[PDB]
């Protein structure tokens, strides 16, 4: 729906900075990181209003097409109709997600993927920049 | 280095790509188009490849077929360095802005109104991609 990027070969130790514009009417947006569309080490989905969630961040994994156990975050530094930046650090055991306000939290790497080769965006978000750091 | 689709780049926008050119570089390329078989722009600076030495080769690809090459003298590129290129387009041409200030045009052969595919490859490592 939004950007799909493959042929990446991000490895442990490297950082992704993603800046985007959140829609005025945003309901939800997501960032998928993984091997391919069925093997996601990280599905990051801030829900403004969707699936029954309100101002909640839902994080999950996807293994061979099937979703894992959700993990919710109540930290919610996102405003509809804004331009935000999120940074994801890929470590061996887990991922660190750094929010626009500085807040950080971790998510485990349940796949035990050694690299990130796929990135996708969806929902109510317009990718503006992707950086490798 | 990267294969991207659903880019939906439109006229009026500027695509900015910044990356580092390898120490022992032979070539690097940026492809823009519909898909891998249908490119409105293959931008390939060759430090030394296919017989070409310090030359910028540009072309199109229509249904898998390369089109007529266009060669540029300007070669504001040094190996081992970090470069940035800015591409914008319209119905008739693609404008490519290089480091030295340098800039040229390339015809919009397929007359695409939106660019959905971008690939980046060769002796170049992508540091950032922006849509301004
Ligand atoms: C509280 C609770 O259990 N809610 C869930 C939803 O989160 C879930 O929605 C799916 O969530 C996955 C992430 O795990 C993807 O975001 C997918 O897009 C969502 O639809 C649904 C269905 O799986 O189940 C409960 O409603
Ligand atoms: C002088 C000359 O005509 N040389 C050409 C090549 O440049 C060309 O190589 C391909 O060129 C396309 C651009 O047209 C891409 O850069 C592709 O990667 C290159 O292989 C070849 C092959 O089509 O034809 C002549 O040699
Ligand atoms: Cl699979």
UniProtKB/Swiss-Prot annotation, chain A:
GO terms for molecular function: lactose binding; laminin binding. Its main location: secreted. It comes from the Eukaryota. Gene3D superfamilies: 2.60.120.200. SUPFAM superfamilies: Concanavalin A-like lectins/glucanases. The modification N6-acetyllysine is found at residues 11, 27, 106, 126. Keywords: Acetylation, Apoptosis, Cytoplasm, Extracellular matrix, Lectin, Phosphoprotein, Secreted. Signal peptide: none annotated. The modification Phosphoserine is found at residue 28. The keyword Secreted applies. GO terms for cellular component: cytoplasm; extracellular space. Residues 2-133 form the Galectin domain. The modification N6-succinyllysine is found at residue 106. InterPro entries: ConA-like_dom_sf, Galectin-like, Galectin_CRD. Transmembrane segments: none annotated. It is found in: Secreted, Extracellular space, Extracellular matrix; Cytoplasm; Secreted. PROSITE patterns: GALECTIN. Lectin that binds beta-galactoside and a wide array of complex carbohydrates. Plays a role in regulating apoptosis, cell proliferation and cell differentiation. Inhibits CD45 protein phosphatase activity and therefore the dephosphorylation of Lyn kinase. Strong inducer of T-cell apoptosis. This is Galectin-1. It comes from Bos taurus.
């Amino acid at each position: 729906c939004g950007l799909v990027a493959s042929n990446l070969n991000l490895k442990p130790g490297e950082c992704l900075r993603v800046r985007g514009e959140v829609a005025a009417d945003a309901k939800s947006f997501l960032l998928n990181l993984g091997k391919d569309d069925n093997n996601l080490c990280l599905h990051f989905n801030p829900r403004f209003n969707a699936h029954g969630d309100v101002n909640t961040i839902v994080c999950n994994s996807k293994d061979a097409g099937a979703w894992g156990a959700e993990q919710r975050e109540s930290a919610f530094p996102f405003q509809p109709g804004s331009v935000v930046e999120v940074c994801i650090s890929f470590n061996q055991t887990d991922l660190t997600i750094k929010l626009p306000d500085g807040y950080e939290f971790k998510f485990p790497n349940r796949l035990n993927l050694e690299a990130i080769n796929y990135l996708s965006a969806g929902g109510d978000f317009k990718i503006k920049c992707v950086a490798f750091e």
